[PDB]
Amino acid sequence: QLKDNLVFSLGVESDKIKDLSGNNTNLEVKTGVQIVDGRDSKTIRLNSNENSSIIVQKNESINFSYFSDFTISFWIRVPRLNKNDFIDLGIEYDLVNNMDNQGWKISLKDGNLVWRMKDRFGKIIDIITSLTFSNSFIDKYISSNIWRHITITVNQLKDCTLYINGDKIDSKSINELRGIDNNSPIIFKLEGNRNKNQFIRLDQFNIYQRALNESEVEMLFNSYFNSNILRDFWGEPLEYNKSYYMINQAILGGPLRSTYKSWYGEYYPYISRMRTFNVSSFILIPYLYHKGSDVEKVKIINKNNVDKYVRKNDVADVKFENYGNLILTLPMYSKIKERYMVLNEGRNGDLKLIQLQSNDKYYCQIRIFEMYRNGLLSIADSSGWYLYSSGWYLDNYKTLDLKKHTKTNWYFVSEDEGWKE
């Protein structure tokens, strides 16, 4: 029932950009704006050209007057920090702007997000997130090419609070601030960036006529993961029959490879040592695609699929595309009794893709069902790490330490324009 206070919601419906709130707010979408594939059907894409903007005239409901609390929320996907972005080092640039002499704006700066309010006396309050790639890449860093949910709550006279993925990040006292209302439109547009390769994907940009509390923001975030679909690394629905790189959470830059062990009759998949590149001397980025290497591409296959989407608890095979006809399985127990996985034409047991955490996680776990070697797919403990079915992790899942939890989480990654290497 957060819908009760929703006065504006920018998204795509039936091939068109609209206000989805029902309020029928008047938008001007210029011809440079695109509609692309998103985290939940289609999303807006803004490019670095003059025709790529959306202008929204404000009305009474969309009001930032001194006597009105409000919340702004949105899904954003910002390309992973790259060398082209360094031309904008230390320079804030606009994404969403309702600033004339006074007002508010949402900006990007040094891979981070800026919220700024300025009142009619020139009083300024901003939140500048201070995330670093090394420490926050996976869960919160903005310039990651991963879908992030942003919430900003404004209780005028009290505080301004910023959230990523339903978690409070920062807050400021705004008791000193007076009015930020103005008569200018809200402009959705990249403005001020010298890196003209920059582009942003933006979805469910919502304005609410109340300041949501911390519990309400968590609930809002959770409401975007109400289905049983699994997710890819970027936060988009996981699909069948789609080429992926498969990655273990414990070694993000470790490429999935395979090796024929002549002794046995078997090909063994393994995670190789972490590969990284430098964007600067101070920032190491993991390779995900490993172009110009023997990295194993995979597809998730299920002849009983109902649509293209992978759902929690589906039984499915992981097919190794390099080989054409081999799947991830265990070897015949009589031959090899150990829990190491091999690549075999012969299906030996069942794989189930599951989510033992919450629906919002962009990884999954993989449950092996086999007569003698039931377990969760993990990496064994180096040069590389073999895949194996862990009975111990399965039976003790709820109590596992962080490292073991990490080794049982799997990501699927597809190439995207917003992640270049």
Author numbering: 834 to 1214, 1221 to 1260
Pull verbatim passages from the article behind this deposition:
To analyze if the SxWY motif is involved in toxicity and to determine the presence of other cell recognition regions, recombinant PMP1 HC was crystallized (residues 825–1260) and its structure determined at 1.95 Å resolution. PMP1 HC includes two subdomains, a N-terminal lectin-like fold (HCN) consisting primarily of 15 β-strands arranged in a jelly-roll fold and a C-terminal β-trefoil fold mostly composed of seven pairs of β-strands linked by loops (HCC). The HCC is the main region associated with cell recognition, and in PMP1, presents the most structural variation compared to other CNTs. One striking feature of PMP1 HCC is its general hydrophobicity, with an array of a dozen aromatic residues exposed on its surface and its lack of clear binding pockets. A fourth loop composed of residues 1213–1222 (loop 4) was disordered, but seems to occupy a different position compared to the equivalent loops in BoNT/B and TeNT that are more protuberant. In addition, the mutant affecting a surface-exposed tyrosine hydrophobic patch (Y1100D/Y1101D/Y1173A/Y1227A) also nearly abolished toxicity.
Here we analyze by comparative genomics Pb mosquitocidal and non-mosquitocidal strains and show that the active component in Pbm responsible for Anopheles toxicity is a complex that contains a clostridial neurotoxin (CNT) that has high selectivity to anopheline mosquitoes, acquired through a megaplasmid. We found a second toxin locus (ptox) flanked by insertion sequences and transposon elements. PMP1 presents the conserved SxWY motif in the binding domain (HC), which in BoNTs is involved in ganglioside receptor binding (Supplemenatry Fig. 1C), as well as the conserved disulfide bond that links the toxin heavy and light chains, and is essential for toxicity. PMP1 is thus the first CNT that targets invertebrates.
